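Researcher: Next sequence.
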Amino acid sequence: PLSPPTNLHLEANPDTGVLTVSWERSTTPDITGYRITTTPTNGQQGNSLEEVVHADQSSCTFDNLSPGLEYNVSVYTVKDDKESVPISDTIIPAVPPPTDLRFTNIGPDTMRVTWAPPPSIDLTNFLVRYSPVKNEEDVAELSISPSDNAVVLTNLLPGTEYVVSVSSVYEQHESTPLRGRQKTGLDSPTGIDFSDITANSFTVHWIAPRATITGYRIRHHPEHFSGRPREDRVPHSRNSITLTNLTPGTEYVVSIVALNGREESPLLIGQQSTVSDVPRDLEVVAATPTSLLISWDAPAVTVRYYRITYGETGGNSPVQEFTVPGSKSTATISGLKPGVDYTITVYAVTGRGDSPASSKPISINYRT
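Model: Next structure:
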C-alpha cells in the first residue's frame, strides 16, 4: 500500500486567488506523483478543482478559488493506478478587500471617499469606518450598497485629520480594511465688521474659524486699481486690522482667508467705503453788489481749517484765497465786482505742517 502525505499546510492569499498546498512527502518509495483536490465543504456549488504533481514535488497552487467560501483540500500519494488514503483539511479563503482609496471633494466639513471594489465577487455590501485621527474612539460606521464605490462623509470637523477605512463584506466575512487618512479643509472666518472709519482708513474685524490656523491674509481694493491688490498677513492671534492710506470717499472690497501653512480657507468677503473729507452743499446764502456770504456743510471729518478761493469764472488769472477755522462753515467774500461771474471753491484742510493734507475741492459759479 501507499503511505499518504503528512504535514498538510493550506495557505490562502488574503485577496483570494492563490492557495498554496504543501505537504511532507509520502514515506513509500517508488511512487509516481501526487494528486490534489479542492471542493466546497459539505457539498455546495463552488469550484471543485484538481491538480497533479510529480513525486519529487511537494507543493501545488490553486490560483482559482472562490473567496469567502469553504473548501476541503485532499492530497493523495499516487503510484500508477493506485492511491493512498488522502490527507484532507478545510480552509475558508479570505474575503478580498477593495483597493485604490481616493479622496476628492474635500471641504471644511465633508469629503468624498472612493475605492475600487474586489473584482469578480458579489459582496454583501461595504463597511465604511472613520474617525478623527486624534479622537480614535469617536468612530462612525456606514454600510454601503455593494453596487457603490463611494461615500460622501458629512458633518465633519474643519481642519481635522480623519482616518477612513472601507471593508468588503460577504455574509459574515469582512476583509482587511482599505485604510487612508485625509484632513478636512479650513472653515472661513465669519462676521466681517468695520469700525473706526475715517477718510483714509478703517478697522476690519472678523470671527475666527473653528479649525486650527496660523494666521490670516487680508486683501483690499477699490473698484479700479492698476496692479496687485495690497495684502496683509497676520498671526492667528489677530481678529482685526486697521487699513491705512486709503483714498477718501472710496468703496473697498475686503477679503480675508484663514491660513494654516499652505492651507487656505474659503473667502470671507465684505465692502466698506471711507468717509469723504470733501465739503458739501456749498452755496451763496446772502449777497450784496460787492460781496457773497457763502455756506457749506462740513464733511464728516475733523477739519483744521477751510481754504476758500475765488476768481472770475473762466478768468484764468490767479485766484484769491483766505482761510476759515475748521469750526465754522460760513464765510463772506468782500470787494467782489458785479457783472462778474465768480467761481468759489472750498477745501477742507485736515493735515498740518508745511504741506497740510487737504480734501478735494467743491466749488460753484455765482450768477451776479
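Model: Residues 342 and 366 are 5 Å apart (CA to CA). The chain has four domains: 1-94, 98-184, 186-274, 275-367.
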